[PDB]
Amino acid sequence: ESQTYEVFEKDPIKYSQYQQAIYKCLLDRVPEEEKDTNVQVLMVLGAGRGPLVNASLRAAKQADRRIKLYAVEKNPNAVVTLENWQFEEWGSQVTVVSSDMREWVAPEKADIIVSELLGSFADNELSPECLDGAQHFLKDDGVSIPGEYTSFLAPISSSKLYNEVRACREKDRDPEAQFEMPYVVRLHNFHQLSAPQPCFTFSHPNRDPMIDNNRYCTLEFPVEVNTVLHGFAGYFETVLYQDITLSIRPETHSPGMFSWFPILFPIKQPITVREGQTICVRFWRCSNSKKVWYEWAVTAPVCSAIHNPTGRSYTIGL
Amino acid sequence: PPNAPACMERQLEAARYRSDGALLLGASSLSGRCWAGSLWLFKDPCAAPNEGFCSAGVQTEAGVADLTWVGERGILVASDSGAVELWELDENETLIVSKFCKYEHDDIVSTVSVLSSGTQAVSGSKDICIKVWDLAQQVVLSSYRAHAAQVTCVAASPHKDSVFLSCSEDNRILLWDTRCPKPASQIGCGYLPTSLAWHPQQSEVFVFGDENGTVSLVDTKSTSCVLSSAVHSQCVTGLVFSPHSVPFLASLSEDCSLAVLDSSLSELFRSQAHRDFVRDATWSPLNHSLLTTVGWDHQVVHHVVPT
C-alpha cells in the first residue's frame, strides 16, 4: 500500500547506507581519468516509490559520475508514483520498467543491480529467487548491492509472546496453524536464552550452477540458565558493499534503523530447559515451482513436531 | 508562441479546419498532477502539434471534451466542468478570448454541435440531458431529458436549424425536430450508438457508428433496409464526410486506425499511422484529398487520400 511504502521510506540511516554503498562502487568501477568516458548502467530492482533510485542520484552526485538509471517495479500502483517522479523531476536519466524482474528483457546488461528485497529474516521476502532471475542481465563482471545477506536465530523464552500467538487461532483453519508461521514483532517482554547464531546465507551474484536456494541448518544453542523456551527470534545481517552493512542482530545492530523489526518463529508446545543443557534446532528453507517456506524442529533437549511441514500452515508466494 | 502556455497536453481531442485553411486544436491532459485543457490555432497545418510554432494559444481551467467552429472567429467548447464555453479570436487573430463560461450541465459535457444558422448550438452531456443554446444571448433555450443513459453524440442538421441527431448509451438514436411538441423520435434499425454524421448532400440520409466498430447507412424516410459494414474492430469514435460534391466517409476508431470509404461503404484507404486512439479527422478546405487526423499519441498525421 501507499502508506506501507511511506513507513519503509522514513528510515534515513537505511537509505544513507545505500547511498554510501553505491558511492564506493562508483569510484571502484570508474577511475578519475574516466569520469566522463564511462556511464554506469544502474538497475534498481523492486524500485517501490523511488527511494533507492533517489539515493542512487545522490550517490552519483557525491561520487561525481554519469549513470544510466532503470527502475524495474511489478506493483503498478507504485509504478504510477515512479512515472510521475520521472516526468516531473528525474527526466530521461531514469527509465521506469513496469515489470516483474524475472520477466523483463533488458536493452543491455547492468554494471550494478540494486535491491531492497529483504525482510526481517533476510531471504524471507524472497530476495534469492528474484535476483537469480535477474542475474542474466548483469554484466559478466557486475556488482549486486546487496552482495550478501545472512539470517540469524536465537532461542527465546516469553510466556507472554507465547500467549499472544495462541490468541491468533481462527475458525475454518488448523486449530494450531498460528504456531506454524513466523510473525514480525518488536520483541519486548522476553528473555534471550542464547546468543544469536547464523542460519542461512545468500550471496549475489551466484556464479555456481545448480545454485539451489533450498537449505537445511542445524544449530546448537548452549543455555546457562533454567527456563521454558517458546520460540526462536530471527534477525538479519547484510553486506551492501565492502564494509557498508545493514543489520538487525542486536549485538551488531545498525544504530537508529527503525525499519525492519525481528521475526518470531513459534513452537506449538513449550519446552523446559535445564541449566547447562543445549537447545538444538533444525531449520529448512523449502520450495516448489510455486511457493517458498520454512519448516523447523527442536531436537534437543527434547523433540518437537516438525513445524509447517510442506508449508501446510504458511507459505511465501513466488 | 504568443501570450500562451508553453506546453500543450499529450491527448489531442479535436482537429477542425476553417474556411481559409487554418487548423483548430483542442487538447486535454487525461493524466498527471493537472487535468486541465487548452485551445490552439495553427495557420500552418504542418506546424501542428508544435506548441511554440502556433498563431494563437490559450489555457482552459478544465479539460476539453468536444469542440466546434462558431463561424471563423469563435470556438464552442464542451468541458468536463459541466460547462459550455465560447472562445472568440481577437482583432489580429493572435489571442483566444473566452466570451462565456456557462455551467448548466450537471456533469462533463461530452458533445457539442453548432446548429446550421450559426446562431444556436446543441450540447449533449453525461448528465443524460440535451440542451439548446443561444450563442448571442449567453443562455439555454431548452433542456431535454429524452435519454436514459449518458449522451454520447449530438449532430445538428446541415441546413434545418431545428433538426438534429442524438445517440446515447441507452441504445437510442433520436431524430429531433424542435418544430413538434414531442421533439425526439426514436429511429430504429443491436450495439450501442457511438458516433453520428449527417450526409452533406442528401439532407435525409445519415450514418452512425457503433461500439462494435460497425458503420451503418440510415435513411430518415424509412426505418428499414439499412446498408452496413464492419469497418473497425473497436468502437467508432467519429465520422466525417469529405468536402467533395460526391463526399467520402472517414471513420476514426479505438482500434488506432483511420478508414476511408465510398458510397457502398467499401474501404479505399486504411491508415495505421496512430499508436494511440484516433480522435478526429478534418479535410482541408483547400486540398480536398488531404485529411488531418489528431490522436492521443500527440501525432497530427496528414494523409493523401487516394481518390
Binding site: 500500500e1 501507499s2 502508506q3 511511506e6 516509490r49 503498478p76 500502483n77 504510477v80 508514483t81 512515472e83 510521475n84 516526468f87 | 499529450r10 486535454s28 487525461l30 493524466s31 498532477r33 493537472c34 487535468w35 486541465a36 481551467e61 478544465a62 479539460g63 471534451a65 468541458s79 468536463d80 466542468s81 459541466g82 460547462a83 455551467y103 450537471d106 456533469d107 462533463i108 453525461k126 448528465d127 443524460i128 431535454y144 431529458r145 429524452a146 436514459a148 443513459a149 449518458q150 437510442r172 433520436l174 414531442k182 421533439p183 423520435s185 426514436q186 450495439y191 461500439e211 462494435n212 474492430s233 473497436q234 479505438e254 482500434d255 488506432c256 499508436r275 494511440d276 486512439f277 492521443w296
Partner: protein, 303 residues
Amino acid sequence: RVSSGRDLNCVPEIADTLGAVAKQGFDFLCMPVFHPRFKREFIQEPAKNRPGPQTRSDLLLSGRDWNTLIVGKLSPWIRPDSKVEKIRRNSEAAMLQELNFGAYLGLPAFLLPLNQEDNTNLARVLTNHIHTGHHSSMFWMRVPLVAPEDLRDDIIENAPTTHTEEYSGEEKTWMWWHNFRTLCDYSKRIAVALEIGADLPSNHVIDRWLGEPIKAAILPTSIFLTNKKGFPVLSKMHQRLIFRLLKLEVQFIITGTNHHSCSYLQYLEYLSQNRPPPNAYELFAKGYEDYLQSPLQPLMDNL
C-alpha cells in the same frame, strides 16, 4: 452538525479542488481516482502499450488525507456487463485496476454505479477484489430511488412514457440492489448511496430502503426548489425524507453543477438543527442502536 461531502467528476488540481471543497464546508470529496475520460486498453496493441503515468501521484496528498477525505469513483466508461465481449474483458481489467488503486491509497470508500438490471459481472469482479488482498475499503453502490428510464421527460414521440401505475415496476431499483448484494454474499463492505430524484416516487418505494444499509444519500443540485430570497430549499416531502435519513445517520453527498448564489449545505444544516426533539428513549438508546446483546438470565446467572 451534518457529515457532508462534495461530488464532482472534474478535478484539474487535487490540492486546489480539495482546498476549495473544504473551504465551502465539506467533510469529504468524491472524485475520480483516474481521469473519467481516460479510456485504457489491456488486450490489443498499440493502445495497450500506452506510455507515461496512468493517473496523478499519491504524493499530492498526505496518507491521512486519503484515509479521511477522498471517496474514489469508478470511471463511467467501465462497463463489466456490456454485451460486447471485448468491452467486458477490458472493463473487468480496468475495474480491478481502479479498485486496487483505491485500495493502494487507503481510501475509506469507493463509489460504483448501479444503473442497469444486469450487474452480474460487475458483482463478480467486486467480490473478487474483496477476496484479493487485505484492504477494508467500504463500497458505496450509487443507486437511484427512481430509474433514469422512468423519470425521462415524455418527449419521444414513438416511445411514450408508460404512465400506468406499475406497483412492482415502481420499485425496480430495489431489486437491482437486492440481486447485487445477494450475489456478493451480503458482504458488510457493500453499502448503499441513495440518489434522491427531482420527483419523489411512491411512498411504498421509499419503504423498500428501510432496513437497508444506507451509508450515504446523494442529493443533486437539480432537486432544490428556489425560495422568495433566491436561495435553494427543498419541498416538504423531500424534507421528510431528509428527516428519516438523519435518524439513519447517513452522510449527505451534494452532486451536480451550481444553480444558486455552501447554500445547499446550509439548508441541510438548518434542517438538522430544526429537527424534532429526540425523547429520553432516543437519548438513552443513542449508542445502543442495532447493537446485538444477549438477554440477561438472572435466575441462572448473578447480575
